[PDB]
Amino acid sequence: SPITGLVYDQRMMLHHNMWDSHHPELPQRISRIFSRHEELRLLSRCHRIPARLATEEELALCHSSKHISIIKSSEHMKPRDLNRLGDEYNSIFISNESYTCALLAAGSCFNSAQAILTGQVRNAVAIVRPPGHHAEKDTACGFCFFNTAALTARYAQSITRESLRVLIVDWDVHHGNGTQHIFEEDDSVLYISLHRYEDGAFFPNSEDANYDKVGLGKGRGYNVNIPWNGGKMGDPEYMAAFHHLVMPIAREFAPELVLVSAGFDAARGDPLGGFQVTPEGYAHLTHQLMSLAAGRVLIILEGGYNLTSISESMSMCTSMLLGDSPPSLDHLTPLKTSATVSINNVLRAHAPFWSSLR
Numbered sequence: 001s002p003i004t005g006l007v008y009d010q011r012m013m014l015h016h017n018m019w020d021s022h023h024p025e026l027p028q029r030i031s032r033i034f035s036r037h038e039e040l041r042l043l044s045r046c047h048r049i050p051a052r053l054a055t056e057e058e059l060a061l062c063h064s065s066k067h068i069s070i071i072k073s074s075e076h077m078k079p080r081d082l083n084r085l086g087d088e089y090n091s092i093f094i095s096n097e098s099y100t101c102a103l104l105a106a107g108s109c110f111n112s113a114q115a116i117l118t119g120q121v122r123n124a125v126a127i128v129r130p131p132g133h134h135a136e137k138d139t140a141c142g143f144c145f146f147n148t149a150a151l152t153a154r155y156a157q158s159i160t161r162e163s164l165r166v167l168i169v170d171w172d173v174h175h176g177n178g179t180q181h182i183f184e185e186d187d188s189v190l191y192i193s194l195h196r197y198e199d200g201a202f203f204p205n206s207e208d209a210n211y212d213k214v215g216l217g218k219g220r221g222y223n224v225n226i227p228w229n230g231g232k233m234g235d236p237e238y239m240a241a242f243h244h245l246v247m248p249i250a251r252e253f254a255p256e257l258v259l260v261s262a263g264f265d266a267a268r269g270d271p272l273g274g275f276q277v278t279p280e281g282y283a284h285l286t287h288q289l290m291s292l293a294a295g296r297v298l299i300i301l302e303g304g305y306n307l308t309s310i311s312e313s314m315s316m317c318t319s320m321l322l323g324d325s326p327p328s329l330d331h332l333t334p335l336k337t338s339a340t341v342s343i344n345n346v347l348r349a350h351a352p353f354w355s356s357l358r
């Protein structure tokens, strides 16, 4: 009986950009990742989980009725009207297939979480597009329509109990502004993001992503931002952040389910990120999170734009979930000075809330 689930459906390739056919969020992102799983003989080792559509009642766990109704109406618009609607948001393109593809991405992740929680599988991966982490309650943003990861947390609570403890780890190179805002006054969902910041000048261009935003109300302490400035970061800085911050806070919270907002745009070779994390580095981050929540872990694709880099990086994560031995990293070398400044600023902000840090 396979201990790892996998979901993929080629219908999610139909969303496309009719005015700019080389735009980086390409249909072949998901088909290239699936083909590499066949070449490495990983697909036959997994249990295949089918895709489905999310329902409109499920979308209302996080989104307004007006936002649901506007995106739904684009299914039948003519080209001139699709171009006008898209230009009303920050960095969005739309075709007649976009609404259906965003529904399939969300429902694929609901079926995966249900298989994990009922014990049919121990853990799982989801090869899905368009992405989710910039979408807000009332608007679309940054290539994203509905917030797939935030919806999956609320779905899991609805079928078990309202206070089920969920951790979301966001290792995409950009800040997830929508996920932060949805859970900002909530102590049942812990949000932890690592991201390129540059004093507010990198997308999405807001001071909401700095280390001093810690949560609101009864949610004070349950929002953790790790921002990078002035440096091309890689394996040494990401391992240091996990050892001093991510893993001590996670163990004290003691989650019952772990969701990864797993973009691969911090990887060596990415044309938007400019950073240097390796496939062996992503394998070590995956193996550390497998020690939490009695092993209940779901990996969800977000961004990432070098086709060879994302195919090798996500395949190594699946190999770790199946139980293979982790590969060795490069030799030890000094951290960059600005990265130690960032880690010290986060420790000073969260020490009042977490005894494992003081």
Ligand SMILES: O=C(CCCCCCNC(=O)c1cnc(N(c2ccccc2)c2ccccc2)nc1)NO
Pocket (backbone or CB within 6 Å): 022, 023, 024, 091, 142, 143, 172, 173, 174, 203, 263, 265, 271, 272, 302, 303, 304
């Ligand atoms: O991932 C996400 C979603 C992120 C949304 C970002 C919106 C602002 N837009 C860019 O950030 C951006 C940066 N770069 C480039 N391209 C480029 C690519 C293909 C064709 C032409 C140009 C580029 C390449 C090399 C050197 C200079 C520019 N395109 C867009 N969230 O997690």
Ligand SMILES: [K+]
Pocket (backbone or CB within 6 Å): 170, 171, 172, 173, 174, 175, 176, 193, 194, 195
């Ligand atoms: K992030």
Ligand SMILES: [K+]
Pocket (backbone or CB within 6 Å): 183, 184, 185, 186, 187, 189, 190, 191, 215, 219, 222, 223
């Ligand atoms: K929170």
Ligand SMILES: [Zn+2]
Pocket (backbone or CB within 6 Å): 172, 173, 174, 263, 265, 302, 303, 304
């Ligand atoms: Zn990204």
